[PDB]
Structure formats: structure tokens, C-alpha cells
PDB file of N, CA, C and O in Angstrom:
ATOM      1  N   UNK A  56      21.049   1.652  -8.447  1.00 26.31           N
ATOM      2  CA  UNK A  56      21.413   2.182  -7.138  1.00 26.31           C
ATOM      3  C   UNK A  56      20.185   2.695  -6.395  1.00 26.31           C
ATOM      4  O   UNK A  56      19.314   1.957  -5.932  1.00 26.31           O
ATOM      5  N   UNK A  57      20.192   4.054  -6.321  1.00 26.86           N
ATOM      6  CA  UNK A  57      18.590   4.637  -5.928  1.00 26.86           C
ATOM      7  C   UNK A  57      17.373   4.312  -6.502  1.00 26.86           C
ATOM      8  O   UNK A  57      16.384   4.539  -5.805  1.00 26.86           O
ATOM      9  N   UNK A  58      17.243   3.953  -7.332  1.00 25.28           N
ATOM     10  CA  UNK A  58      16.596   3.375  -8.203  1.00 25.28           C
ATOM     11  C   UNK A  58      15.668   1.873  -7.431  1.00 25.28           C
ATOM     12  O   UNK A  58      14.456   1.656  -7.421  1.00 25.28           O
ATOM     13  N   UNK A  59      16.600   1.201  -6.960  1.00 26.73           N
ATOM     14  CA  UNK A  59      16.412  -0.378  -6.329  1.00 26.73           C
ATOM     15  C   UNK A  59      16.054   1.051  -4.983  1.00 26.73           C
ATOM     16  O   UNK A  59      15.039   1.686  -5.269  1.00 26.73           O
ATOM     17  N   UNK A  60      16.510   1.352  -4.150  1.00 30.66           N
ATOM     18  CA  UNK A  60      15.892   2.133  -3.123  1.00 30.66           C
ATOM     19  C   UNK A  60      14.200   2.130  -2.952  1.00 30.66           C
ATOM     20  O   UNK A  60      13.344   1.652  -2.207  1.00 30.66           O
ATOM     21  N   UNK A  61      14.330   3.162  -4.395  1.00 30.82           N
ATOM     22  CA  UNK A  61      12.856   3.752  -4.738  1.00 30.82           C
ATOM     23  C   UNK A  61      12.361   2.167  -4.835  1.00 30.82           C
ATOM     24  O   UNK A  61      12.073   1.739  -3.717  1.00 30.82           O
ATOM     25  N   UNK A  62      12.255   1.553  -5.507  1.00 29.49           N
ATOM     26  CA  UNK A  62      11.429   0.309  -5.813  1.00 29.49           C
ATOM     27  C   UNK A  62      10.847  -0.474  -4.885  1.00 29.49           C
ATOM     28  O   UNK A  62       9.792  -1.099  -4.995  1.00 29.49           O
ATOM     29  N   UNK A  63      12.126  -0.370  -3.281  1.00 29.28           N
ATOM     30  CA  UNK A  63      12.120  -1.104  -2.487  1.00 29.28           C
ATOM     31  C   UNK A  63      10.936  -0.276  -1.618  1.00 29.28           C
ATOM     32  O   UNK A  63      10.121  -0.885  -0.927  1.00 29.28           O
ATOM     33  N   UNK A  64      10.945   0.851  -1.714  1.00 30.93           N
ATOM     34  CA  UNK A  64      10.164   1.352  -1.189  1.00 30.93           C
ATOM     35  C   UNK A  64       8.719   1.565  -1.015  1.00 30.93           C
ATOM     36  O   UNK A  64       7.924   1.706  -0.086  1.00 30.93           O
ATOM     37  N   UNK A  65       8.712   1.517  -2.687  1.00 29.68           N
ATOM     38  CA  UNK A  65       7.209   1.413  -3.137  1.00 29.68           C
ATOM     39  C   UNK A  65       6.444   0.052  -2.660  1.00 29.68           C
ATOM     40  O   UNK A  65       5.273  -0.130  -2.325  1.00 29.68           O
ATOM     41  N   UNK A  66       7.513  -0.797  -2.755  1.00 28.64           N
ATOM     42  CA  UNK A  66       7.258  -2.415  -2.380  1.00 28.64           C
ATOM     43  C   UNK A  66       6.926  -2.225  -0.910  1.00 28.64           C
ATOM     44  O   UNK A  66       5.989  -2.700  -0.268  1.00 28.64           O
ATOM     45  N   UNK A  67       7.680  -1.608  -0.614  1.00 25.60           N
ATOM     46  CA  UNK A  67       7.101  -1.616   1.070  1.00 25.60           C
ATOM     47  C   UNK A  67       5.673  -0.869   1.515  1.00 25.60           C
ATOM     48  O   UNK A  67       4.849  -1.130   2.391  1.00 25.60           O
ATOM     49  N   UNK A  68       5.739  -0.111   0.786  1.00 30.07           N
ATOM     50  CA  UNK A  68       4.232   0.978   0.586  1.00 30.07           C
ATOM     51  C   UNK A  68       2.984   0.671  -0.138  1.00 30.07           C
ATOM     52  O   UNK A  68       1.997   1.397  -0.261  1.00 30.07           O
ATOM     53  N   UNK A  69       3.208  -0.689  -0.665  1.00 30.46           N
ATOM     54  CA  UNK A  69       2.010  -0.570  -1.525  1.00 30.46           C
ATOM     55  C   UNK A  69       1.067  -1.428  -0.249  1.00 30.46           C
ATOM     56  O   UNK A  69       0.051  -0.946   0.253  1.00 30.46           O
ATOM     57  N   UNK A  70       1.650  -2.774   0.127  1.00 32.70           N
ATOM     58  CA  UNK A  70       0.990  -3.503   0.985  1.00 32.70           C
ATOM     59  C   UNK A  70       0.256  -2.475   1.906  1.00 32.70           C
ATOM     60  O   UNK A  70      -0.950  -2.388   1.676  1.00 32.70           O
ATOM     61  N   UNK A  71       0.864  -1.485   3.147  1.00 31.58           N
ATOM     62  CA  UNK A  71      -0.046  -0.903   3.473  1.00 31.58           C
ATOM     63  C   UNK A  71      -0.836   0.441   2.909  1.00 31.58           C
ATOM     64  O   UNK A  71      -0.969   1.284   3.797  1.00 31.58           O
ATOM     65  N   UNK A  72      -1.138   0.652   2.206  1.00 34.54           N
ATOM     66  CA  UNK A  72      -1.533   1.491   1.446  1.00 34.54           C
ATOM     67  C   UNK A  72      -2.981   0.493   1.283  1.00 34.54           C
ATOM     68  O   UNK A  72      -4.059   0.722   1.832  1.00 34.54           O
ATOM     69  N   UNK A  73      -2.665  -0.635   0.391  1.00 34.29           N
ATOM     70  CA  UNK A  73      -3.830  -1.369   0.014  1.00 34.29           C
ATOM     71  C   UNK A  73      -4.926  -1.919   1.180  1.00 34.29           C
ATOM     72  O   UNK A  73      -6.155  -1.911   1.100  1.00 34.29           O
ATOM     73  N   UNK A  74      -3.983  -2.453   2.411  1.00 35.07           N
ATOM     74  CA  UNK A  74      -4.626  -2.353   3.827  1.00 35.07           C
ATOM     75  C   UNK A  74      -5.483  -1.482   4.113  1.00 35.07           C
ATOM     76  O   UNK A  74      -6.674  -1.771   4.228  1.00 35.07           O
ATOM     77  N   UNK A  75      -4.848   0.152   4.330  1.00 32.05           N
ATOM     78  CA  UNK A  75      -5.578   1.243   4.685  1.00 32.05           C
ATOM     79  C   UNK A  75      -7.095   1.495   3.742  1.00 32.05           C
ATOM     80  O   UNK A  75      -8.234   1.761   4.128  1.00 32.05           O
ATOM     81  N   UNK A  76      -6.608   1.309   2.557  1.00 29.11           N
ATOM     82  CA  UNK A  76      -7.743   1.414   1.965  1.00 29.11           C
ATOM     83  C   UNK A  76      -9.182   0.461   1.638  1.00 29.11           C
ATOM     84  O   UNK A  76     -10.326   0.663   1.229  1.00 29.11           O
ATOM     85  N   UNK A  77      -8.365  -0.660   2.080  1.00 26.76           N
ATOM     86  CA  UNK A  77      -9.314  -1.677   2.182  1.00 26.76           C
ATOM     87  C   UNK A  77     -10.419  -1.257   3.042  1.00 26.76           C
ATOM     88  O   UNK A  77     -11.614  -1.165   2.759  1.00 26.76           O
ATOM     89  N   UNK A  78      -9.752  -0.996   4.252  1.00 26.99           N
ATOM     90  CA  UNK A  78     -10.416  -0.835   5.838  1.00 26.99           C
ATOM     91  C   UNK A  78     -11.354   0.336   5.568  1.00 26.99           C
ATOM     92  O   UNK A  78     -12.542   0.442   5.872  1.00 26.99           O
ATOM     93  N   UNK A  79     -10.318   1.449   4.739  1.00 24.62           N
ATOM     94  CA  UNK A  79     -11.620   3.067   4.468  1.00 24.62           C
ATOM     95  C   UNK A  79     -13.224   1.937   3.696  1.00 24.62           C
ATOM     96  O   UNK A  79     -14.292   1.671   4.249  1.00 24.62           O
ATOM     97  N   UNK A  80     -12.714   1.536   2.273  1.00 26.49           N
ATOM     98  CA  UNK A  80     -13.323   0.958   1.767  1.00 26.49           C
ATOM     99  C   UNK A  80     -14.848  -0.015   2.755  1.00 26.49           C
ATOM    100  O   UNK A  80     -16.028   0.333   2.740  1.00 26.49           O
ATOM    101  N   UNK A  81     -14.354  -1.023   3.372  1.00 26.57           N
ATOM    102  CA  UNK A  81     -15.222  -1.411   4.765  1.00 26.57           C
ATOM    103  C   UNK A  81     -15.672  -0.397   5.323  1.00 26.57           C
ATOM    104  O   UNK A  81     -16.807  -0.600   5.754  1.00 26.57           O
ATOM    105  N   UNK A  82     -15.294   0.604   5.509  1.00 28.03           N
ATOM    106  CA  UNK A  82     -16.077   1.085   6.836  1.00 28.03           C
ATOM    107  C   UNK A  82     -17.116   1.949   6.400  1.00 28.03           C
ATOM    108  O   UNK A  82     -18.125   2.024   7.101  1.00 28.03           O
ATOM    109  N   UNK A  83     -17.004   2.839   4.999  1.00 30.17           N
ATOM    110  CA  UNK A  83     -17.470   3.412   3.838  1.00 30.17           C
ATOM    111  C   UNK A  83     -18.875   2.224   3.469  1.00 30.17           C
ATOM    112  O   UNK A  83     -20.035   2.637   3.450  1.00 30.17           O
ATOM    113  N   UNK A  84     -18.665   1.333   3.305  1.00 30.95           N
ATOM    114  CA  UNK A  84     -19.756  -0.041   2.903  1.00 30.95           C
ATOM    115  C   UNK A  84     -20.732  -0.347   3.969  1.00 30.95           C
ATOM    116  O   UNK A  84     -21.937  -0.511   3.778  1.00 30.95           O
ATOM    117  N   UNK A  85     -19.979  -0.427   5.375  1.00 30.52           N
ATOM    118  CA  UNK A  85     -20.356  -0.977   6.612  1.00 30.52           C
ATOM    119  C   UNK A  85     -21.576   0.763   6.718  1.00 30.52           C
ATOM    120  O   UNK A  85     -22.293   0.956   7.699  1.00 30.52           O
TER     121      UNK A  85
END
């Protein structure tokens, strides 16, 4: 039940999460 929620969520959060940090990551390099 909540469970699939939470999961769905994280699923939705990881993509930008990994984005954001990419970009810190770049700009940190740059």
C-alpha cells in the first residue's frame, strides 16, 4: 500500500536529485 507510495516516490526523486547534483558537481569542476 504506502509502501508502493514511498517507492514511487523515491523513484520520482532520485532522477532529480542526481540532475541537481550533477550540475553542483559541474559547476564545482568548471
Amino acid at each position: 500500500s504506502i509502501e508502493e507510495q514511498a517507492k514511487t516516490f523515491l523513484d520520482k526523486f532520485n532522477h532529480e536529485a542526481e540532475d541537481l547534483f550533477y550540475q553542483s558537481s559541474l559547476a564545482s569542476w568548471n
